[PDB]
Design a protein around this ligand. Structure first.
Ligand SMILES: Cc1cc2nc3c(=O)[nH]c(=O)nc-3n(C[C@H](O)[C@H](O)[C@H](O)COP(=O)(O)OP(=O)(O)OC[C@H]3O[C@@H](n4cnc5c(N)ncnc54)[C@H](O)[C@@H]3O)c2cc1C
Ligand SMILES: Cc1cc2nc3c(=O)[nH]c(=O)nc-3n(C[C@H](O)[C@H](O)[C@H](O)COP(=O)(O)OP(=O)(O)OC[C@H]3O[C@@H](n4cnc5c(N)ncnc54)[C@H](O)[C@@H]3O)c2cc1C
Lengths: 26, 296, 289
């Protein structure tokens, strides 16, 4: 199986959160 | 199977014994001048709620009703992908519209659960039930054409779909089809998550199409209000051709009634091609290609 | 100063009245097979803690000291860039190793934190490890263990973010020393950066218990640096080269040893040369424990 992640955001293509969890208003 | 229903789960938690989560973040995502307020909230789940894209969770708001019984649960489409907005699989997010309106008698009605949710502050507890539903699960085909038609909070399941499709890396799923999102809202101040969708558009310009329909502002060439169906009509040719393909899946979510306007445009589209939309829709529905989740 | 200290903020919050943040996430980033545990955690700050790359924040762990008074604060290098992991300037991240020597108070309190719980934050603290202003400078980062924290902060701003006022186009070289491969903190993030900016980022790992040089010696950070002796020395002779070192106190020794050999070739005394670099803001050290 794939090795255990050594980074917190390996679930994302860019290895970082894609956007803020406190979305910007229009 | 045509949908991602591998080992799906529902009702792990019931209103009798809900999962007690905590609000981590709660943000108003609509402009101060929007007709109503819509909030994006993130709740901790400790990874105990096994939900997937397209499902909903029930919320039992605090308090009691007129007859001294706990409030009945209200359902909310999950706005986050299965792994949550943090990517750690320990949270769930909702896109909630604060229900407030004045009736003919001049009495203001404040919805119990929606106001409870929008009033939640970081640290407060929230009673969660579910997961709930299977009607809006994603297509299994990673090369499918996915047309998403939403109004208002109906954007929720589509945000869930899109985060998995364009931001996440999965061993068993690599989307390379065409996702087309149509979102109808009354004002520009009512646009939801636009910044997020624009990022997706820049990341995958050939696999994602994005169209907003701001009904109280925009109009077509004839001067008609830009409802979701009005925007769809501007791509009549393109959409009709996609609808005739077996790998095209349509999803509709939002306020009940949006369905009527869409049927009107579809009846015309099919007719020009010598087809009876009402019957064609039945065909699509049985083929799992016309998925609807609308609410009053 | 040659560093990014414009409108810098320090000591906005004091231990007497800390900023109360909330834990958003806390994940163990070391593999199960690692001998110890290191956790990556994110706290919400409501944007009230205006820190920048290279600074630290203090944490007053919950509980009481032997006299029933609040615990003294412990400092932690911020592992996130100024805008934070979520790019909204509303969060801060730490890279914490569970300490046992008795159980360390603050490190274990932090690694035990669950999403939703409150954490007392002080600071920001520090000006020593700030980034160079020159966007085309050579930035050499030498870290061991959690010492990787400020460098993750640096690298995120350099390669994971877009800034109208800052476009890094120099050379960033990271050396990270750890005991095992299961202890290579943030490995995937750095490899992604290397794939993204192959000409502006160099990456070298030194796994002491698994690697050895051509002489059969354990691969410590200095042991790996020695393989690029010529290159590093040439870079150290340039005025736009800034070196940063962070991690456990003691890592300095081994590095000086290999350095004496380098400077020696050019008839230069390392210890004094390093001193001139330090006073020129080009040799910045932050070691602890
Ligand atoms: C599958 C599904 C997904 C949903 N997703 C979302 C979402 O993502 N975001 C979001 O904001 N909302 C969503 N909703 C709507 C949500 O469930 C609540 O109905 C809404 O928030 C109003 O709730 P309330 O408790 O605030 O109002 P209430 O206090 O319950 O008042 C609602 C009003 O409905 C009227 N009435 C008419 N029909 C009914 C009925 N069938 N049941 C009870 N009362 C009725 C009454 O006049 C009442 O005052 C969803 C609903 C469903 C079924
Ligand atoms: C600028 C700066 C940045 C830092 N950044 C980080 C970081 O990014 N990540 C991180 O994990 N830590 C970092 N630290 C270390 C952190 O501040 C704490 O010292 C560490 O977590 C131990 O804390 P504790 O509260 O758990 O231990 P404590 O309860 O305070 O016990 C540790 C104390 O034991 C004493 N000493 C006695 N015996 C031993 C022994 N056997 N081993 C070691 N010390 C001994 C020392 O005085 C030491 O301070 C940083 C320190 C500084 C000054």
């Amino acid at each position: 199986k794939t090795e255990q992640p050594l980074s917190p955001y390996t679930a994302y293509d860019d290895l970082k959160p894609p956007s803020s969890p406190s979305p910007t208003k229009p | 199977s045509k949908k991602q229903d591998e080992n799906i789960v529902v009702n792990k938690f019931k209103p009798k014994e809900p999962y007690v989560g905590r609000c981590l973040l709660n943000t108003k995502i609509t402009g101060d001048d929007a007709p109503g307020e819509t909030w994006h909230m993130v709740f901790s789940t400790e990874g105990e709620v096994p939900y997937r894209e397209g499902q909903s969770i029930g919320i039992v708001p605090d308090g009691i009703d007129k007859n001294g019984k706990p409030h009945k649960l209200r359902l909310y489409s999950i706005a986050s992908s299965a792994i949550g907005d943090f990517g750690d699989s320990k949270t769930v997010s909702l896109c909630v519209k604060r229900l407030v309106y004045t009736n003919d008698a001049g009495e203001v009605v404040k919805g119990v659960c929606s106001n409870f949710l929008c009033d939640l502050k970081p640290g407060s507890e929230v009673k969660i039930t579910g997961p709930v539903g299977k009607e809006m699960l994603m297509p299994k085909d990673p090369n499918a054409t996915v047309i998403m038609l939403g109004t208002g909070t109906g954007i929720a399941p589509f945000r869930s779909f899109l985060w998995k499709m364009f931001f996440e890396k999965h061993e068993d799923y690599q989307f390379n089809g065409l996702a087309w999102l149509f979102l109808g809202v009354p004002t520009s101040s009512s646009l939801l998550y636009k910044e997020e969708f624009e990022k997706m558009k820049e990341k995958a310009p050939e696999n994602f199409r994005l169209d907003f329909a701001v009904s109280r502002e925009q109009v077509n060439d004839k001067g008609e209000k830009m409802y979701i169906q009005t925007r769809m009509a501007q791509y009549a040719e393109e959409l009709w051709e996609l609808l005739k393909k077996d790998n095209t899946f349509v999803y509709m979510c939002g306020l009940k009634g949006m369905e009527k306007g869409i049927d009107d445009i579809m009846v015309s589209l099919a007719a020009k091609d010598g087809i009876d939309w009402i019957e064609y829709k039945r065909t699509l529905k049985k083929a799992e290609q016309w998925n609807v989740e609308v609410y009053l």
